[PDB]
Each structure stands twice: as C-alpha cells, then as structure tokens.
Design a protein around this ligand. Structure first.
Ligand SMILES: Cc1cc2nc3c(=O)[nH]c(=O)nc-3n(C[C@H](O)[C@H](O)[C@H](O)COP(=O)(O)O)c2cc1C
Ligand SMILES: Cc1cc2nc3c(=O)[nH]c(=O)nc-3n(C[C@H](O)[C@H](O)[C@H](O)COP(=O)(O)O)c2cc1C
Lengths: 199, 199
C-alpha cells in the first residue's frame, strides 16, 4: 500500500551529493508508488535555535501549552506521514546544526514525549546520511555506533517511531566519486523498499 | 601555572542550571588562579548555520581562503587560551543546535583539520542532563557522547587532553542532584591543571 513520507532535508546547497541522495530516494519512492513531501530546512529558513520562551515551555512540562506556528506546521506535516526520512551530510559526527535544531524545537513535550508516552504515529523512519569517512572507519571510531544510539535510538525509536533503518553513505570525500553510484543505488533501494520492515 | 580558559556556553535562558554550572566552574577557576573568557553564544547572537558560501569554502579545502569575521574572532579567543570548556544542557543526546553550529562553522579547514593549528592543552565538557549518568552509561548514550564530543570534536582536532562530566539527574522540579553537580563543576575548575604524565 502507498505510503506518504515526510523527508527532512538539511543542506545549504542547491546542488550537492545530499541533493542527489534526495533525488535517488524519491525516485525509488515513485517506482514503488509512494509519495513524499520535503522539509528543506535551509530553503524554508527554518529557525533552529530553541528560544528562551520555548525552553521555559518545555521545562514546564505542560502538554497543552502553545507551540510556535512553525512547529505546529511541522507537526501537521508529520501527521500526514506514514514514514519519516532524514537526509543530510555527517558534520562533526552528527547532523548539521539546522537539523539538530529541528529535533530541539519539534520534539516537544506532550508530542514527542510526555509523562513516558508519545503522540507520534510513524511506522518507519529512514536515515540516509552521507559521510566522507567510510563505514568501516566510522565503526572503528565508535561513530557508527553513536549514530545508531543517538539518531536511530534516542531521536527516533525513543519517541515512538515503530521501525528504523539507516544507510551510512560513506566515502564521499571531495573530488572522489568512487562511492557515488553505489551509494545512490542504496538510496534508491531505500525508497523502493519503504513498505518492508522487521516483525 | 595559571591557565586561561575560553568557555563556550550554550543556553537560551537567563536563568538555568547550566548558568549555575558556569558560575560554579568559574569559581573553581578563580580559586586555582586561572583566568577565563566566556563566549555566551546565545547572547552573542552567534550564527549557527554553516552558509552556502562557507560550505563551498570548506569543501574546497584551501587552508588560506577567507573566513567570516565572527569565525576569525572565535579563533582569536581560542588563541589566547590554554584550555577550552563547553557548558551546555543535553538535548536529544548531543549539544544544543547553537553549539553544534559553532563546531560546524568554527572548526574550519586549515585550522581544526587539514594536522591542526589548534594549540590547546585541555578541554573540559560540563554537560547537564535529565537522565542520570548511570542511566546514560547503561544505555550507551554516555559512550556515544564521549566518542562524538571528546573523540571527534576535541581530541580529533588536536586538543591534548579531555575530560567530560555528565551532571545528571536534572529533571524538572527535582533539585536533588543540584548541589552535588555544582560541587563537581567547581572541582573541575579548581582541578583544571591536573593532567597525566609519564610515571
Ligand atoms: C563542516 C563539515 C563537517 C564534516 N564532518 C564529517 C565527519 O564528522 N565525519 C565524516 O565522515 N565526514 C564529515 N564531513 C564530510 C561530509 O560528510 C561530506 O562532505 C558529505 O557527506 C558530502 O555530502 P554533500 O556533497 O551533500 O555535502 C564533514 C564535512 C563538512 C563540510
Ligand atoms: C529540548 C530538550 C531536550 C532534552 N534532551 C535530553 C536528553 O536527550 N537526555 C537527557 O538526559 N536529558 C534531556 N533533556 C533534559 C535536559 O538535559 C535538562 O533540562 C537540563 O540538563 C537542565 O539544565 P538547564 O536548566 O541548564 O537547562 C532535554 C531537555 C530539553 C528541554
């Protein structure tokens, strides 16, 4: 059955490998008959810093407290989705600040977590992260593990996403296209195969 | 010997536990004869998003290419220091987007990596968390944070020695761990000079 994905995309450039990954993933989605919408956070000029007001609201732990309009819009986008996707380059072993801020501001008390329960209704999340380092190298530095723990674990499974998968699209150092085609295939496959998961 | 510390502080609120942590840490530094400068990133209106123009510069990998004025100022502040400190609340298992963006923008090619130009004897991380350090150690999050913050972002750019204190148990409405955590923060300032040496 057709699924609808909300894809969070975090990159300042119009053209970069991350954009190609987005194109490949959506290509795979289309082949399988799935749809998507994109939260192109840089192009949206999405505010990434949790404000003093928002912080005080979060600390107050009042699930019915107001949220800013941009966060309300994000929640509406998620509400239309059966799946989430996150497409970004690995910067200093985590997401770009812009996407980190999306978690800080959008994973709100009473929505992503409350006292622990959740209101997020998402069957699957796909993380497609491109890195300069190879997957082999990222495993050795504990960085691959940190990504599974922090991104897949804490930020996704930890807020009620039912199933998660990640492709670390590694080896993407400047001026080296050797891993490009293989990584784009992995992205296409991820979109084509969205409906399938563990049980 | 007296050391100078450049302290990166990341929190939107005028009053928070992190602010008291800063106060406790600075008290210890002064007790021990050390000096410091605080970079209050929110107060500074610090731009946390790596822009398209900065991105192109970083990808080009030209050590001598121009840097934004705000980044140049950060490099001067670091240059005056013998030590760095990072004081922030744990948000979604990493630092606030504001501090993440500081790494994205300030750890530039030709400076933080290329070899390194960073000349810093010690970095201290004081991270306040809702979860206890015990629970974070148990789940793998503490290890992830060591791999990411201590490993990649600090040791990985040439910092010679690193320490992280997880000041945990700071859940809303509970002051039970407050005094002990402030004691730890103060101690970290007082004991800044402590370092391992060959037997
Ligand atoms: C600011 C910055 C930080 C980066 N940090 C890492 C890193 O921590 N680990 C890694 O493997 N690659 C790192 N890289 C390399 C990027 O992951 C790589 O350039 C990216 O995946 C390429 O995708 P893009 O063309 O969409 O930018 C970094 C690149 C930049 C510009
Ligand atoms: C947006 C947000 C995200 C948080 N994420 C985490 C987390 O991932 N793990 C954790 O142990 N505590 C988390 N907390 C609890 C904070 O770490 C806690 O509020 C903070 O340490 C208190 O210090 P402060 O008064 O300086 O903000 C989070 C709090 C907020 C507001």
């Amino acid at each position: 059955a057709s699924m609808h994905v909300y894809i969070l995309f975090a990159h300042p450039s119009r053209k970069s490998f991350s954009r190609e990954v987005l194109e490949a993933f959506t290509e795979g989605l289309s082949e399988a008959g799935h749809t998507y919408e994109v939260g192109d956070l840089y192009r949206m000029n999405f505010r990434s810093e949790l404000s003093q007001e928002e912080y005080l609201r979060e600390i107050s732990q009042e699930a019915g407290s107001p949220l800013p309009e941009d966060v309300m819009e994000e929640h509406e986008r998620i509400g239309r989705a059966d799946a989430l996707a996150f497409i970004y380059p690995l910067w200093w072993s985590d997401c770009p600040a812009k996407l980190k801020g999306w978690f800080d501001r959008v994973w709100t008390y009473g929505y992503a977590y409350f006292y622990r329960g959740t209101r997020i209704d998402i069957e699957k999340a796909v993380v497609l992260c491109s890195a300069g380092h190879t997957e082999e190298d990222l495993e050795g530095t504990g960085i691959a593990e940190s990504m599974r723990s922090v991104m897949l674990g804490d930020r996704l499974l930890g807020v009620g996403v039912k199933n998660v998968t990640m492709e670390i699209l590694g080896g993407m150092v400047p001026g080296d296209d050797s891993c490009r085609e293989i990584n784009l295939m992995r992205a296409r496959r991820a979109g084509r195969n969205l409906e399938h998961h563990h049980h």
